[PDB]
Write an enzyme that holds these catalytic residues in place. Structure first.
Site, PDB file in Angstrom:
ATOM      1  CG  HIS A 280      50.774  48.303   2.967  1.00 29.22           C
ATOM      2  ND1 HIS A 280      49.977  49.404   3.189  1.00 29.22           N
ATOM      3  CD2 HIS A 280      51.815  48.417   3.825  1.00 29.22           C
ATOM      4  CE1 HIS A 280      50.540  50.176   4.103  1.00 29.22           C
ATOM      5  NE2 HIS A 280      51.655  49.597   4.509  1.00 29.22           N
ATOM      6  CB  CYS A 298      55.474  49.782   4.508  1.00 31.00           C
ATOM      7  SG  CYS A 298      55.108  48.354   5.524  1.00 31.00           S
TER       8      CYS A 298
HETATM    9  C1  KTI Z   1      54.560  48.983   7.099  1.00 31.91           C
HETATM   10  C2  KTI Z   1      54.461  50.486   7.305  1.00 31.91           C
HETATM   11  O1  KTI Z   1      55.404  51.159   7.463  1.00 31.91           O
HETATM   12  N1  KTI Z   1      53.135  51.032   7.262  1.00 31.91           N
HETATM   13  C3  KTI Z   1      52.789  52.426   7.476  1.00 31.91           C
HETATM   14  C4  KTI Z   1      53.134  53.012   8.668  1.00 31.91           C
HETATM   15  C5  KTI Z   1      52.796  54.328   8.891  1.00 31.91           C
HETATM   16  C6  KTI Z   1      52.088  54.990   7.921  1.00 31.91           C
HETATM   17  O2  KTI Z   1      51.710  56.311   8.094  1.00 31.91           O
HETATM   18  C7  KTI Z   1      51.716  57.067   6.925  1.00 31.91           C
HETATM   19  C8  KTI Z   1      51.741  54.332   6.784  1.00 31.91           C
HETATM   20  N2  KTI Z   1      52.096  53.088   6.591  1.00 31.91           N
HETATM   21  C9  KTI Z   1      54.220  48.104   8.001  1.00 31.91           C
HETATM   22 CL1  KTI Z   1      54.338  46.390   7.673  1.00 31.91          CL
HETATM   23  S1  KTI Z   1      53.694  48.458   9.661  1.00 31.91           S
HETATM   24  O3  KTI Z   1      54.514  47.692  10.522  1.00 31.91           O
HETATM   25  O4  KTI Z   1      54.077  49.770  10.032  1.00 31.91           O
HETATM   26  C10 KTI Z   1      51.968  48.040   9.940  1.00 31.91           C
HETATM   27  C11 KTI Z   1      51.085  49.143   9.376  1.00 31.91           C
HETATM   28  C12 KTI Z   1      50.784  50.251  10.131  1.00 31.91           C
HETATM   29  C13 KTI Z   1      49.977  51.225   9.598  1.00 31.91           C
HETATM   30  C14 KTI Z   1      49.487  51.091   8.322  1.00 31.91           C
HETATM   31  C15 KTI Z   1      49.795  49.984   7.567  1.00 31.91           C
HETATM   32  C16 KTI Z   1      50.599  49.009   8.102  1.00 31.91           C
HETATM   33 CL2  KTI Z   1      51.024  47.572   7.178  1.00 31.91          CL
HETATM   34 CL    CL Z   2      58.840  47.578   8.891  1.00 28.36          CL
END
Ligand code: KTI
Ligand code: CL
Ligand code: CL
Ligand code: NA
Length: 351
Positions: A280, A298
């Site tokens: 994403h 992710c």
């Molecule tokens: C994926 C994920 O690890 N996203 C994410 C987490 C933390 C950060 O900080 C840099 C960036 N991206 C998913 Cl599916 S999640 O469960 O963690 C939901 C999430 C949370 C924050 C941002 C995007 C997303 Cl999709």
């Molecule tokens: Cl995850």
């Protein structure tokens, strides 16, 4: 002066007759003059006599908990003969409906398994597998493997070859699937394998490299799960794709205002595991992409690259993660089928 002889596919007084098959009557030393079959309410079951008059068969599926009366008359050069047969069909304790993925007429990637998901637990997995007829063209060997008590998967040993037709006939109606559970209906699906698309995320380089039919068409820097929440290695199957999707951690018990909490509308999100791994858009982590891992698992990429991925991948394409500090994606994740060694998958888990 032989009298005509009549043969039926049912027996007078039979009980528990399964409705997964039509009922037929055959004549020898003569021809069928009339054949009728009616249920306990007097309602007839549609059937057709063959042009040569030797074979009659029902053309309408029979019903459960019914009592059928079959009457047949044959006439021959040697005389006439008639028979009457009554029988009762299966009385399920409960019915279960199958659901097949991918959808009919779809074009999917080389990693897409056949999935048959029931809405009840399946006690007789072997009965289910036997009632599901898979046709492949070009033909390849495959095998069933159960992700859980309700969903079975089928795939060959290696990724599909593009141009392959896959036909799925789930012929569960009338089939005893164990403990009184019977199939609620039949399902028919057909799909085709399209281009080979395999994306490789290598934690050593932190690059996601997209290969289409063996040719590198796109490289995009990525930030994967941090050391404390790393992205599992292994083979992932592309699932659903979202132009945007709202995600709230409190939905799954993690407060939003906790270190691992989140509540955001995510852009260009492509699911690659049931466990929650997505490709994403992560504009906040553009600097770290290609250098350090910062996510919860992710594969974070740039907005333009996330849209590129969304636009250029389809259900069943492959994402392979390698060299992370994490483990291997579970084979029963839901999109991790390919991580089970073929010998284990082939052996199955029917019993
Ligand atoms: C994926 C994920 O690890 N996203 C994410 C987490 C933390 C950060 O900080 C840099 C960036 N991206 C998913 Cl599916 S999640 O469960 O963690 C939901 C999430 C949370 C924050 C941002 C995007 C997303 Cl999709
Ligand atoms: Cl995850
Ligand atoms: Cl999620
Ligand atoms: Na009855």
């Amino acid at each position: 002066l032989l009298v005509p002889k009549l043969t039926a596919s049912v027996t007078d007084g039979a009980v528990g007759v399964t409705v997964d098959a039509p009922v037929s009557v055959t004549a020898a030393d003569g021809v069928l003059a009339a054949v009728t079959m009616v249920n306990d309410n007097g309602r007839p079951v549609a059937g057709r006599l063959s042009p040569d008059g030797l074979r009659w068969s029902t053309t309408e599926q029979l019903g459960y908990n019914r009592r059928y009366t079959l009457n047949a008359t044959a006439l021959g050069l040697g005389g006439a003969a008639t028979r009457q047969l009554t029988f009762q069909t299966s009385s399920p304790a409960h019915l279960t409906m199958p659901y097949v993925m991918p959808g009919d007429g779809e074009v999917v990637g080389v990693g897409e398994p056949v999935a048959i998901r029931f809405d009840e637990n399946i006690a007789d997995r072997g009965a289910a597998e036997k009632a599901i007829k898979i046709t492949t063209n070009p033909p390849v060997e495959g095998a069933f493997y159960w992700l859980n008590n309700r969903e079975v998967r089928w795939r060959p040993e290696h990724f599909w070859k593009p141009g392959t037709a896959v036909d799925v006939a789930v012929n569960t109606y009338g089939v005893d699937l164990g403990e009184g559970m019977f199939g609620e209906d039949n399902v028919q699906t057909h799909f085709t394998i399209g281009d080979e698309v395999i994306a490789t995320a290598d934690d050593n380089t932190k690059i996601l490299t997209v290969r289409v039919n063996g040719e590198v068409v796109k490289s995009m820097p990525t930030s994967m799960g941090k050391d404390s929440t790393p992205t599992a290695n292994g083979i992932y199957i592309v699932g659903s794709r979202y132009k945007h999707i709202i995600m709230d951690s409190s939905t799954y018990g993690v407060p939003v205002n906790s270190p691992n909490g989140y509540r955001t509308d995510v852009d260009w999100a492509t699911q690659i595991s049931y466990s929650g791994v997505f490709v994403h858009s992560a504009p906040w982590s553009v600097g770290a992409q290609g250098h350090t891992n910062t996510s919860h698992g992710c594969l974070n990429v740039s907005p333009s690259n996330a849209q590129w991925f969304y636009d250029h991948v389809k259900r069943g394409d492959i994402v392979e993660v390698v060299n992370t500090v994490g483990g291997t994606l579970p084979g029963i994740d839901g999109l991790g089928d390919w991580n089970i060694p073929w010998d284990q998958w082939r052996a199955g888990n029917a019993k």
